[PDB]
């Protein structure tokens, strides 16, 4: 029973592998890029099954020209005892062999086998460093990604910094797009994993992210640069970038990525004085994970110092587990700024003594200093009057008849005309 | 069948400040208990209140005797004969709701009703189980069954006769309430039905009209609610029967805020003891406050806090705090000034609000179109 | 049925008087209009507030200085009422395209 | 023209919904495109002429 169903699943997975190989072969036909991402898109689906039988069948099936590069995976490859070339000795395309080696890499990655995984990944990316074909650039992106992933659970992410830097440059000269973006994101993750935020920031300023990058890669890059600018006091742009990242993240999957981005967005918005909307704290897939961040947010809204301290004491482990402890401390000292933002949002004119009384600041001069500091930033638009005690807010002129809507709607033109231009450029009529 | 909420919400689930834990309501529940003897309300009564008193089993003895006798009668009438469709089997399950629902539980009754539904053809049985278990899941906090049954009735069952489901919006009084559903829909079907009630099983007419008024004046603040809830005939008649509700409604409509707040406090308190208590009494009294504040702020450009306090009940400082809290929440467009003691309204004109809405909706559409464009053509 | 009708007639007459007065004025003390209409300041203020709220007379009431202001709302808005709706309309269109995207 | 374009957009949405449940087998789109083109040409010309007038005549 189980053996029969397992065999059918293995056969259908092998058929999908055959189809992917044929698609990669067709990609070089016509001398055009793409048609490889079609095979690479179902990569998680194929990766899910990856039985030993199907992997061995594929290895024996597409490698009629036996060389040593396969004679390394064979020692770890286990064949069925009692239990197909799709068919001459035509030499293998580099993309095809890279693909099959990549699924080997993924299987050995899944089964917690890491050291020989490091070896096979090393032998995989050693060869592709010699090629100069754009068809092998799309596959190279995933190759590097799972190479870094292999080195991650091997706890040697620091070693690969040189290799990723070299491949990133190589992609930069060859005007690579997918490989360049994947390498840049891997480099950013490497820098962050060892808290080298200054190095990551310096790298970001000197490297331009390709606009034609994939949605997932764009989201990852946005999250990484948002974390950079958030731990680098550029809170407003960090929040903007994090929201942009959440927009481009996959909707169905990517639970962990969305959880991390939501946690950081909560902390950044709280630091900015704004209040995150309660809606995100309610989705199932996000609720419990954000539960520690929820009890925190309430305190920020109330300014209850004791509640903040208790939440920190009972959830510091979780906060450090996702690396939000330091930002949370900065928030613990910016709760007052949040309160001042709320006060100035509600009131138009208000005496400083009222500020001190409402915020429990225990001093009118201290409230004066705090509101002056907050209004120095873009936190509050006001105009303090020390002669009397006002915190008079700026007059709200009619935004219409003010050239501001013209500017916004001009940006929206630029965007929509740009979208139309790319859409009409990417029509790609066929030859026959 | 089982009308008075079985007194169980007001029974010992309203302790502390509401304090309702023992009174004549316990007597009413116990008389509704002893007649058609039941042990199902005695689950929690076997745990916390009247846990192991003499009566707890002194009633259980002949209760079990009676329910065994009647279940035996039903089983004999079910096995001896082979009655089809709406039959003695449906009688067994309707009793089983008059029973084990009020002996131990709905689960057996839910199963039996499912079986007879597979056996029956006509539709009132399905509505019967809908309301049976809506009230049971108001006893035991069930909503998925209610919405499943409502979908079954409305989408599929309501292709023969009609005129029945409307009042089963009572769940919609408490489904999406604290944002959109304590009102809007819950009022547009209460209003659509107030003329033709014909559902006295769930609630008397007076209670239905009070619910209708309560949900309509939060659904509709002054968007010509008068065309349906003030010029309304039957609502006006029952309001002639109910002075408190009529005063509470017309005080808001006639801008008599000083008495409108006292009526709202009375509504809050009498609402804190209901099937409607636990869901949104806090929410309703916040929304009505915001509604009255926006009504007063409208038709004004700058109001002295003293004028508000004297004309809106009391509490210059109370009104200051409330306006601060409500502006901080983004509602109640107005800016409050300190010791100058002015409140300035900043409601944008039609053009500016139109521009802001254009920006918002266009940003939504542009993000959608950007995502769509980028996932296509890679 | 004669007290109710006469009270309604009195309110109608008060509204008609109040709109047939203040028409000259663009920003007038409520005290002056109370004097002109021979009614209490609080009574006429309440009636004015109710009339504004019912949108039976365009204007605003600045209680901070005890004044009543009169103006009109521009009807140029109509194009946005189309514009906005069209946006939501094509929102649906984009949604449909998403389904076709699921085809590809 | 914007009202006509709204009606055309409703028709376009209705027609596109049919596109899904229809294999390869007046267009509310072509009319939509024509209205869009006339709107953009008219308003672009009017804007540019207006501001050229603002800045060439003092």
């Amino acid at each position: 029973a189980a053996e029969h169903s397992q065999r059918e699943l293995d056969t259908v997975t092998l058929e999908d592998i055959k189809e992917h190989v044929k698609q990669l072969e067709k990609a070089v036909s016509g001398k055009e890029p793409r048609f490889v991402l079609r095979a690479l898109r179902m990569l998680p689906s194929t990766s899910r099954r990856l039985n030993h039988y199907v992997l061995y069948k594929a290895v024996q099936g597409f490698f009629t020209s036996n060389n040593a590069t396969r004679d390394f995976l064979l020692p770890f490859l286990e064949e069925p005892m009692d239990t197909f070339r799709p068919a001459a000795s035509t030499p293998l395309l580099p993309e095809v062999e890279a693909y099959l080696q990549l699924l080997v890499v993924i299987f050995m990655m899944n089964s917690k086998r890491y050291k020989e995984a490091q070896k096979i990944s090393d032998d995989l990316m050693q060869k592709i460093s010699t090629q100069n074909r754009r068809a092998l650039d799309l596959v190279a992106a995933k190759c590097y990604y799972y190479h870094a992933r292999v080195y991650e659970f091997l706890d040697k992410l620091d070693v690969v910094r040189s290799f990723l830097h070299a491949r990133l440059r190589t992609a930069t000269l060859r005007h690579d797009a997918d490989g360049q973006a994947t390498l840049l994101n891997l480099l950013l993750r490497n820098y962050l994993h060892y808290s080298l935020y200054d190095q990551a920031e310096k790298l970001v300023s000197k490297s331009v992210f390709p606009e034609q990058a994939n949605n997932n890669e764009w989201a990852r890059y946005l999250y990484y640069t948002g974390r950079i600018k958030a731990i680098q006091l550029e809170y407003s742009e960090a929040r903007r970038t994090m929201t942009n990242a959440l927009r481009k993240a996959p909707q169905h999957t990517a639970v962990g990525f969305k959880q991390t981005v939501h946690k950081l967005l909560i902390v950044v918005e709280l630091l900015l004085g704004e209040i995150p909307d309660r809606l995100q704290f309610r989705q199932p897939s996000l609720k419990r994970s954000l539960m520690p961040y929820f009890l925190l947010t309430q305190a920020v809204r109330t300014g209850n110092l004791a509640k903040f301290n208790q939440v920190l004491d009972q959830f510091g482990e979780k906060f450090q587990a996702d690396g939000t402890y330091t930002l949370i401390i900065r928030l613990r000292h910016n709760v007052i700024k949040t309160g001042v933002r709320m006060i100035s949002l509600s009131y138009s004119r208000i005496s400083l003594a009222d500020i001190a009384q409402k915020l429990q600041l225990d001093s009118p001069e201290d409230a004066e200093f705090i509101v002056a500091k907050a209004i120095r930033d873009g936190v509050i638009e006001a105009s303090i009057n020390h002669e009397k005690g006002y915190v008079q807010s700026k007059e709200m002129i009619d935004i219409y008849s003010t050239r501001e809507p013209q500017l916004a709607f001009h940006q929206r033109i630029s965007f929509c005309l740009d979208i139309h231009n790319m859409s009409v450029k990417a029509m790609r009529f066929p030859p026959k | 069948p089982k009308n008075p909420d079985l007194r169980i919400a007001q029974l010992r689930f309203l302790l502390s400040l509401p304090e309702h834990r023992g009174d004549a309501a316990v007597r009413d529940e116990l008389m509704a208990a002893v007649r058609d003897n039941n042990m199902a309300p005695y689950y929690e009564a076997l745990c916390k209140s009247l846990d192991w008193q003499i009566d707890v089993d002194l009633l259980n003895k002949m209760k079990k005797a009676n329910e065994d006798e009647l279940k035996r009668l039903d089983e004999e009438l079910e096995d001896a004969e082979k009655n089809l469709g709406e039959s003695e089997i449906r009688d067994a399950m309707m009793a089983k709701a008059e029973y084990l629902c009020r002996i131990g539980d709905k689960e057996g009754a839910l199963t039996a009703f499912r079986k007879t539904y597979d056996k029956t053809v006509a539709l009132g049985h399905r509505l019967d189980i809908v309301f049976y278990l809506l009230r049971i899941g108001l006893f035991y906090m069930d909503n998925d069954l209610i919405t499943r049954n409502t979908e079954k009735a409305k989408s599929l069952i309501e292709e023969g006769g009609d005129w029945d489901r409307r009042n089963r919006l009572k769940v919609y009084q408490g489904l999406y309430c604290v944002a959109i559903r304590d009102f809007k829909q819950a009022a547009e079907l209460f209003l659509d039905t107030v003329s033709t009630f014909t559902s006295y099983e769930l609630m008397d007419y007076k209670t239905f009209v009070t619910y209708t008024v309560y949900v309509s004046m939060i659904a509709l603040e002054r968007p010509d609610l008068r065309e349906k809830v003030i010029k309304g005939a039957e609502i006006l008649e029952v309001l002639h029967s109910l002075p408190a509700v009529r005063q509470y409604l017309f005080s808001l409509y006639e801008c008599r805020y000083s008495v409108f707040f006292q009526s709202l406090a009375v509504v809050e308190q009498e609402m804190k003891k209901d099937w409607l208590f636990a869901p949104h009494y806090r929410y309703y009294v916040r929304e009505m406050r915001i509604h009255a504040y926006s009504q007063l702020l409208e038709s004004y450009r700058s109001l002295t806090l003293g004028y508000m306090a004297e004309a809106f009940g009391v509490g210059v400082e109370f009104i200051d705090q409330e306006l601060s809290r409500f502006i901080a929440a983004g509602r109640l467009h107005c800016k409050i000034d300190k010791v100058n003691e002015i409140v300035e309204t900043n409601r944008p004109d039609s053009k500016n609000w139109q521009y802001q809405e254009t920006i918002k909706k266009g940003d939504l559409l542009l993000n959608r179109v950007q995502k769509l464009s980028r996932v296509i053509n890679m | 049925i004669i007290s109710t009708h006469l009270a309604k007639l009195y309110d109608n007459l008060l509204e008609q008087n109040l709109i047939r007065v203040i028409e000259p004025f663009s920003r007038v003390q409520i005290e002056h209009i109370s004097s002109l209409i021979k009614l209490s300041k609080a009574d006429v203020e309440r009636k004015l507030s109710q009339m504004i709220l019912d949108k039976k007379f365009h204007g605003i009431l600045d209680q901070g200085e005890g004044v009543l202001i009169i103006f009109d709302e521009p009807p140029v808005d109509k194009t946005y009422e189309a514009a906005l709706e069209t946006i939501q309309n094509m929102s649906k269109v984009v949604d449909s395209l998403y389904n076709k995207a699921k085809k590809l | 023209v914007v009202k006509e374009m709204l009606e055309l957009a409703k028709n376009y949405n209705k027609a596109v919904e049919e596109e899904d449940k229809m294999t390869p087998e007046q267009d509310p789109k072509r009319h939509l495109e024509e209205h869009v083109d006339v709107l953009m040409t008219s308003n672009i010309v009017q804007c540019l002429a207006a501001m050229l007038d603002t800045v060439v005549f003092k």
Partner: peptide, 30 residues
């Protein structure tokens, strides 16, 4: 805005039809 959005959405829809029709022809090539 309005006109551009409409024009952009129409162009995007025209791209969907092409990106579908092309893969239809390619799959037929089967």
């Amino acid at each position: 805005y309005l006109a551009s959005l409409i024009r952009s959405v129409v162009a995007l829809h025209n791209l969907i039809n092409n990106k579908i029709a092309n893969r239809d022809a390619e799959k037929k090539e089967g």
